[PDB]
Design a protein around this ligand. Structure first.
Ligand code: CA
Ligand code: CA
Ligand code: CA
Length: 190
């Protein structure tokens, strides 16, 4: 016998494989720094937002930290642990195959009826918009999510059923080169 599979350092790499966008040198730095500020290692919803705020004091990342944190966690404890915290930050940058697509869907389904709803869309789509800006790009451009919203759903639920299931998402998304831009705006930058 030897080491199982539930530790922090080292165990991460083994799992974070195919991604690990934070070589040991990094996660180790925050590890000791995070446990120092919290010997119990527990990032609560409040903390989460606090970090997003300082990052974008000009925006209002409120429902953002909520939606995500809500459709996250694994121990249903109401608190994000170190390994869990970075899991979020990681998926934020870089990805791979449809894996990133499936995850996004679950996040948009504010509820869980295996089906998404226009209500759950505007709410989320609005969170990513009210968060980051758009003038840091190049060509001035703007649009109340109301427009991009009607566009995102119009192409997602191209089957008429009030609600849309993941299956339809991967299809209308993986194909129609357009919904990905917005849908991605939420997931995270490149
Ligand atoms: Ca947790
Ligand atoms: Ca739904
Ligand atoms: Ca549908």
């Amino acid at each position: 016998m030897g080491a199982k599979t539930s530790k922090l350092s080292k165990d991460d790499l083994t799992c974070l494989k195919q991604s690990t966008y934070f070589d040991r040198r990094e996660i180790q730095q925050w590890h000791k720094g995070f446990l120092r500020d919290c010997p119990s290692g527990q990032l609560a919803r409040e903390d989460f937002v606090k970090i997003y705020k300082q990052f974008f004091p000009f925006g209002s990342p409120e429902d953002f930290a909520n939606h995500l944190f809500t459709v996250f966690d694994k121990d249903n404890n109401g608190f994000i642990h170190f390994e869990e915290f970075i899991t979020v930050l990681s998926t934020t940058s870089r990805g791979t195959l449809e894996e990133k697509l499936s995850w996004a869907f679950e996040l948009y389904d504010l509820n869980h009826d295996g089906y998404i709803t226009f209500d759950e869309m505007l709410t989320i789509v609005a969170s990513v918009y009210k968060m980051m800006g758009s003038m840091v790009t190049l060509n001035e451009d703007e649009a109340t999510p109301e427009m991009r919203v009607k566009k995102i759903f119009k192409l997602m639920d191209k089957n008429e059923d009030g609600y849309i299931t993941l299956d339809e998402f991967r299809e209308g998304s993986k194909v129609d080169p357009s919904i990905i831009g917005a849908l991605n705006l939420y997931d995270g930058l490149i």
